[PDB]
Design a protein around this ligand. Sequence first.
Ligand SMILES: O=C(O)c1ccc2ccccc2c1
Length: 404
Amino acid sequence: TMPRWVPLLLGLLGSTTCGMLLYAWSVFIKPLNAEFGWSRAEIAMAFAICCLIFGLMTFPAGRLSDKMGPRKVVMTGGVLLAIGFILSGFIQSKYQLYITYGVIAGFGGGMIYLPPIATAPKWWPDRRALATGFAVVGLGLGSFLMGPLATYIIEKPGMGWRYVFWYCGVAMGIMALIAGAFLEPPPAGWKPAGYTPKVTRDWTYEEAKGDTKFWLLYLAYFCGSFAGLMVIGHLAGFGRDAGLTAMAAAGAVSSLAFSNAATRILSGWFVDKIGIRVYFAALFALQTAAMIAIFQLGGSVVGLSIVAIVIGWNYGAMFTLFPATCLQFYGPTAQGSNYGLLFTACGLAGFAGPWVGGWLKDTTGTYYLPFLCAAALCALGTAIVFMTKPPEKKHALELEVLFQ
Ligand SMILES: O=C(O)c1ccc2ccccc2c1
């Protein structure tokens, strides 16, 4: 039937739509402050709500993708995202923005984000992590696509920022509907392959949800996610405090977007070839080291760039390697449910990480506390990821007894 790279393209399209949605808020920071008395933190509340709902809704999205297929889920998510984003276009108050952008749009976003992550590796049992990475790389590209577009619309005279919400929401709805229209697993039996009585079987959602290793991974995910989201917004400020100009610190920190994108594909290909656990643990350890190392390297464009690139590499890699690990532990059959539940950890980290980092800096007045806390979290994640080996593969005695 359909060439097994089409799923990768579809996940690229859907994840790009989600990256556009999650990047937009920064674009509207200044215009919304121009029209209303709206503070930066007041607008950032809409983003934090968006991350909360988006991360939470992967769980129901994964369950529904497993039960009734990923097409229905992704297309419904497209509808919800389009509705919420466009209604943000017609807003007049903060609560309206929280509802439209944070809740509705974030809801549709989780429903878009998860089903392709669960479907793509099924077409690539020889390259599961690379397939997953194609399902997530779009989150690193939404900036590069939307930034110029949203600036274009905001500054144009017949338009405004409301016009960004309206048009960009039609465009994102179309991309998500095109992604979800052609998305489905391969048929129940034959598996696309040129190459390939005890009888094992993948784990079930109730079985994985009850494994101690699933929650060790959940803890690692929460730690790594929280650490990144706690400091990334502080990189450029660390630079300016070290004596750099705003232009210079901004240039340096911008290399984070490139490594954040590239790692999603490259880390998948790497672990497809050499295995997950050791490289994964090494990434967390390096993330620990970078949280410490910024106090020695962050005072120059070259050092701050290195730290930013490294932080971006490790952070972005989490979103390919946690789904790949979950796929190795439990198999693809319940990957929708297993990984939907697991990603709720990111919903919570998205809600609280940035706020807590800001509070720690403002409480102390210095960057030592947030980066030291992020280093500790990344150290814990390092230990967890390094010590956690796959559970025993499951026996399917009900299939096994079919042999006379
Ligand atoms: O980088 C990602 O893949 C991603 C997507 C959705 C997310 C939602 C909440 C927090 C972090 C998130 C990260």
